[PDB]
Design a protein around this ligand. Structure first.
Ligand SMILES: C[S@@+](CC[C@H](N)C(=O)[O-])C[C@H]1O[C@@H](n2cnc3c(N)ncnc32)[C@H](O)[C@@H]1O
Ligand SMILES: C[S@@+](CC[C@H](N)C(=O)[O-])C[C@H]1O[C@@H](n2cnc3c(N)ncnc32)[C@H](O)[C@@H]1O
Ligand SMILES: C[S@@+](CC[C@H](N)C(=O)[O-])C[C@H]1O[C@@H](n2cnc3c(N)ncnc32)[C@H](O)[C@@H]1O
Ligand SMILES: C[S@@+](CC[C@H](N)C(=O)[O-])C[C@H]1O[C@@H](n2cnc3c(N)ncnc32)[C@H](O)[C@@H]1O
Ligand SMILES: C[S@@+](CC[C@H](N)C(=O)[O-])C[C@H]1O[C@@H](n2cnc3c(N)ncnc32)[C@H](O)[C@@H]1O
Ligand SMILES: C[S@@+](CC[C@H](N)C(=O)[O-])C[C@H]1O[C@@H](n2cnc3c(N)ncnc32)[C@H](O)[C@@H]1O
Ligand SMILES: C[S@@+](CC[C@H](N)C(=O)[O-])C[C@H]1O[C@@H](n2cnc3c(N)ncnc32)[C@H](O)[C@@H]1O
Ligand SMILES: C[S@@+](CC[C@H](N)C(=O)[O-])C[C@H]1O[C@@H](n2cnc3c(N)ncnc32)[C@H](O)[C@@H]1O
Ligand SMILES: [K+]
Ligand SMILES: [K+]
Ligand SMILES: [K+]
Ligand SMILES: [Mg+2]
Ligand SMILES: [Mg+2]
Ligand SMILES: [Mg+2]
Ligand SMILES: [Mg+2]
Ligand SMILES: [Mg+2]
Ligand SMILES: [Mg+2]
Ligand SMILES: [Mg+2]
Ligand SMILES: [Mg+2]
Lengths: 373, 372, 372, 374
């Protein structure tokens, strides 16, 4: 009765991720010029067409076409490949009055919804091992593509990693990869390259190297990008988060300014959860926050430590409440979300990014949590 | 307090419009051609509806007429939206992998992970938070169309928080935001919603003393895609188990059954639901993983959350002997080529006692019982 | 030498595709609703076809299906173009002006100036340069469809220069550019075109020693909207009199008859053509001007170029007594609500001995003669 | 009674907006890259502006910012239109034909026929009907921007009918339709337009008793692309000679000078205008035809309408000795790579005494005179 858990990732060239990138590149340009921007940018990319839509109210001007090209050119496309449509509508004044309170010391929630923060002790990143390996696999392939160490491949790619959790020590069951390749590729070269990368990633995490490898199970993958499959913003929300190990309330991240609690509260919840595990109050922690549009604080909260709590759950809940300010305006500012760049997190997950220096990944609340328990 | 919260969205919500259109298109295709390959994605923003995705079909679907079928009942007309149709054709590199030469097997439409889930909390075998969230909006929409509830528009959301600290659940909070006319009467509006909140609570034998949050924005006249952009597959948690179950990431609407994101999810719900109805567990969650072109799942995990009535090993073993995991086989077993998907593009795909879905049938309890 | 030149373009030319689609749309509207107001403009550029304009109608036209009717014969398929449909309704401020309270009169759809023209040079009563330019491309397209001329595509142009120094006209130059396949045979292609050039010259009893310019680019494989953008109403001189006659500016395709740019131009051609057929002149040009909402022309000018057989005053006077200048009346006299316009969206709107156009009928010669 | 009529349209007219955007785009391209190949077509309908066409250039033009430059002065804002950009690349099969191996010649960008025209009726050497039609709308637009004429919008048309029965012309009718605000004052509106009609007539020493048609629709509040779709190159007669001259069909806006539809038309106007200013004819019309990839006209015809003051043979002969008909040469002679085209996308491309256009210069009169003597 093996216990096999599986998570996936997608590359920079994947059509859903292109949209996520463009949406966050646009957000970045807005916030860079106007830190009171309201931005809710959604992008569609389908065979020859990229539609840039959403609601924005901003003093900035963003050259939407130039921005799309910044993301698309490194993947291998040129200025004649896509028709670009710009349908940028302003934020609804009925929404704005509710978020931007008369009392300028409070920001009301950008929308209702539910978010989940999650953390665990399985990796240095405090993330499920399946997610971390899935992302690392694709990062390493993309890096080798750009360095030209791995040739005759294109940017569109997916990974799936199954891990065996039956014992105290995890075993990799299966590593799967689909990468878009050139017509004139060499399968032997391609297969040896991927395998070497699969083993290197396993060795780097001190794992077994005897796992089953599924390399390009379709048998052929030359048609790819938005030509092969349509892309949309926010259609990789589980890849963006915790790889199906954690729960998810439904909200997407990319293209959203921090007033959209779907994004800021999720980073806040990860911040809490991650620090809770780093403080060794639990092996795993999941935090659920719910919001109501226009209300400055969460409407409901739940902490779940999965029965891995080292101290009484009551004292964990109580430490969290005394160590964190749950006012939306306050946690936005505490996490420096108005000045953070989001493009780097539009690829390879928003969480456990030891390659980045994200505000919500900092273990700068362990002392307060410890002390308050 | 242990407070768990789920949400729902109405027929007029912009994400749900796109989901409706995507599934209305699928329906037309499959109705004409049951070997259609369909992966329709829709965007709706301000004055624009883009209909895109990959389709290979012998059918012809009048994409504009279809968009209107969905949009007219919400109150829009033929001059409100520019319609763009960008239908691409399924990639031949994908098709060769899915359609094996001998039609004996179908390979998986894509890699990924799906989750089925079921529990004993409701007659629908669904989390109470989800069920209440959906029922709330169904009842508002029904009253809107009957004209019992006036001066409201179709765009709406709900959020239901339930207290699970005790053996008997309590409703903590019911929240509703509904789009209203400029000349609405707030008193009328607030009394109407409250009555509906209590009726939904009474119908599930629940407490009636819960906090009510009604239009916390204070104004909600601009709505629809004018207020907020919509896209297909951006309501995947509302579509499924309201954040109580896990999710592997795949959306449902606009996809033919070769896309295992949809078919395997319905299959997993079918399994999980029958497991709970057979009383082998109070809750069950099944995770299946796929590889593109492979006819069976690549991995499987059953989790009963320590609510198993018999040995977990025997539950896993009963599932394996009671269900055929071949993709082509479970598609046919669930009648997915002939099922209509538009009715599930609103108000969740699971626990629909208002519908007659193949994957909601408790027709596998006997086989599961017998095989343990 | 007096060398006069006119051009034509083929069914596959991008401007003409738009003209075809615009008139195919009009046709569908009028076929269902003869009180349709239609002003359909179309753009076709590399992978995109935008269908726009103002329409008020009880009809429904499947704009995508219609675009395909026009594009399929040229060799395109259902995946070649993104279709955008942006059909806006007719302005109510315009409508009140055109549709008078008094239902006996229709006001002019817009201001502007139109020109009718006719001459005695051809059986069609059209300039010889125009007729030859159009015949050339018709014959190439017919041979393409019959498969007598292979390895060519539908996009093509012609230009015909004629020498008018003497009493008998001489062809100076015939020019043709046709889009060809990559693997075409130039020798075959050149012999084919030449034979067609000579056949067209022989059919009009003309010299056969003219210079031939065949595909002066040297290569013409990229064509259609991929090579060059197309728009409705960008072929107005090819549509009319090949630069021999004047033009006031208004385009024809996509317009219902309330748009005087179209109906008054056909009416002016009708007058002019009958004047020449009555032998009151060898050439005749009629200029009518309109004001929006006014049921009759605001100004009028007849020019017979000093080829008048009787006094000009008596020619003007015969015209006035032989024709009703009320807009509603000449629309009905010419049967414009029930005429099909797609056939005239290619190969000119005038002198179409291949068609049976109301405005080409010599049914006013007796009245003109009698009234002088 | 011999009544000739011409029309004009305003800055806010939907066809003209597209023409403006097309030429504003061209301008940006040429400003950055003088070897640009540009063929930009624009559609504007209801809430949508599509920017399409084929461009090969080292430039980058922010198409959205450019559309706004044109649309903001008319009264629109950044939320009014969905903008689509479908810029395609010039066809390499066309480019090889235009950009000859011999870098000293440019082949014609396309086949076609152009017409230059000039006459002695006005200081601009243009038909009186055209001049009056354009002046009327310029003066309305100027007053709109100065705020002398209020509660009007930029979309507008004019039509001027003139009586040519006698030696001295008479204005028959002046017509104007202007888009107005809902709360306008008709009396104010009618007095304003009339004053402008009379001022324009007096300025050309014409009669002032003509019939005035002012907003014959009775209502014109819905306007712009909302009221009526716009496309590039659907005002080719307003752009040229108001239906007095002939036209071969090609449009001007959005085209670089390799498109002979534009450059050869300016060249033909240049010739014709100088021919009339040299007093060799009262009216002159020049017809040039081209073949794609050929560096010179394929055919040429001068028509003086029997108004030639000297023998026609000597006129034809002077033209040939005074003008170089090589395409590359006349492009350079007219400075077409460095000319701005946005100013001519409104109020006609010809007889613009308000501008300094290369093709309006009477700098070939001396050579024509000199070459037409025995
Ligand atoms: C361009 S911005 C503001 C520009 C000006 N710089 C200012 O200070 O206000 C005004 C509106 O444009 C809309 N908009 C449309 N396209 C846009 C783009 N690419 N970048 C920014 N705003 C855009 C937004 O809705 C925004 O409220
Ligand atoms: C397989 S497609 C999914 C559905 C597709 N929309 C259709 O028409 O069936 C999803 C992903 O597969 C990857 N992909 C595309 N073609 C593939 C192929 N032939 N083999 C393996 N992977 C592929 C791309 O990254 C793409 O995002
Ligand atoms: C729609 S079918 C029509 C022909 C039909 N197979 C017959 O012969 O009876 C042709 C192809 O066009 C594409 N298509 C484009 N737009 C479509 C639409 N609106 N409805 C259906 N298919 C469309 C699909 O990719 C499909 O494979
Ligand atoms: C709040 S919006 C999302 C963000 C939005 N794109 C923006 O610019 O802020 C999401 C939903 O809220 C609901 N909604 C829109 N306007 C609202 C308002 N003024 N008050 C309450 N709910 C509203 C609609 O169902 C809509 O899909
Ligand atoms: C579409 S028709 C009536 C269609 C009919 N009720 C049906 O069931 O399909 C009525 C109005 O809608 C607008 N319209 C928008 N798109 C249209 C299309 N493709 N064909 C016809 N009318 C369209 C027109 O302006 C017209 O005045
Ligand atoms: C030459 S194009 C217009 C110029 C174009 N927009 C540019 O970027 O130069 C006009 C027409 O030429 C014809 N055409 C296209 N390519 C051609 C070629 N290589 N040789 C001759 N004719 C051609 C087609 O009929 C097309 O509509
Ligand atoms: C942007 S340009 C050249 C930019 C490049 N940095 C260079 O200097 O060569 C390359 C091509 O992009 C296409 N393009 C698409 N949109 C464009 C725009 N707004 N401006 C210029 N070119 C555009 C044109 O076909 C042009 O030839
Ligand atoms: C009236 S439209 C002609 C065709 C129009 N698409 C239709 O549906 O009938 C042409 C032009 O007239 C002007 N126009 C628009 N609305 C008008 C109105 N109500 N009365 C007079 N002129 C108008 C605008 O300049 C517009 O560019
Ligand atoms: K997709
Ligand atoms: K063109
Ligand atoms: K129009
Ligand atoms: Mg949300
Ligand atoms: Mg996707
Ligand atoms: Mg959404
Ligand atoms: Mg998926
Ligand atoms: Mg064209
Ligand atoms: Mg007109
Ligand atoms: Mg127009
Ligand atoms: Mg031309």
């Amino acid at each position: 009765y093996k216990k096999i858990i599986t998570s996936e990732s997608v590359g920079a060239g994947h059509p859903d991720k292109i949209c996520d990138q463009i949406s966050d590149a646009i957000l970045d340009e807005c916030l860079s010029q106007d830190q009171n921007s309201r931005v809710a940018c959604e992008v569609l990319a389908c065979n020859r067409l990229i539609v840039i839509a959403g609601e924005i109210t901003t003093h900035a001007y963003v050259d939407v076409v130039k921005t799309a090209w910044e993301i698309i050119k490194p993947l291998g496309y040129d200025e004649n490949d896509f028709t670009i449509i710009s349908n940028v509508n302003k934020q609804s004044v009925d929404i704005a009055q509710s978020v931007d309170k008369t009392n300028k010391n409070l920001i009301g929630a950008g929308d209702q919804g539910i978010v989940f923060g999650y953390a665990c002790d399985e990796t240095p990143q405090y993330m499920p091992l399946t997610s971390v390996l899935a992302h690392e696999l694709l990062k390493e392939i993309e890096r080798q593509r750009r360095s030209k160490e791995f040739i005759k491949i294109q940017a569109d790619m997916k990974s799936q990693v199954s891990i065996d959790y039956s014992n105290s020590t995890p075993l990799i069951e299966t590593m799967l990869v689909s990468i878009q390749h050139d017509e004139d590729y060499d399968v032997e070269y391609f297969n040896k390259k991927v395998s070497a990368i699969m083993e290197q990633i396993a060795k780097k995490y001190n794992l077994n190297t005897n796992f089953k490898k599924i390399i390009n199970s379709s048998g052929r993958f030359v048609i790819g990008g938005p030509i092969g499959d349509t892309g949309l913003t926010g259609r990789k929300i589980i890849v963006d988060t915790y790889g199906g190990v954690g729960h998810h309330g439904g909200g997407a991240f990319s293209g959203k300014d921090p007033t959209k609690v779907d994004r800021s509260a999720s980073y806040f919840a990860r911040w809490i959860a991650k620090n809770v595990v780093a403080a060794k109050l639990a092996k795993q922690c999941e935090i659920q926050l719910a919001f109501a549009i226009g209300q400055p604080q969460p409407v409901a909260m739940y902490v779940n430590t999965f029965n891995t709590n080292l101290i009484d759950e009551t004292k964990i809940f109580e430490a969290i409440k005394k160590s964190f300010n749950f006012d939306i305006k306050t946690f936005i500012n505490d996490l420096n979300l108005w000045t953070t760049k989001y493009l780097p997190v539009a690829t390879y997950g928003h969480f456990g990014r030891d390659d980045l220096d994200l505000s919500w990944e900092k273990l700068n609340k362990v002392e307060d949590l410890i002390k308050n328990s």
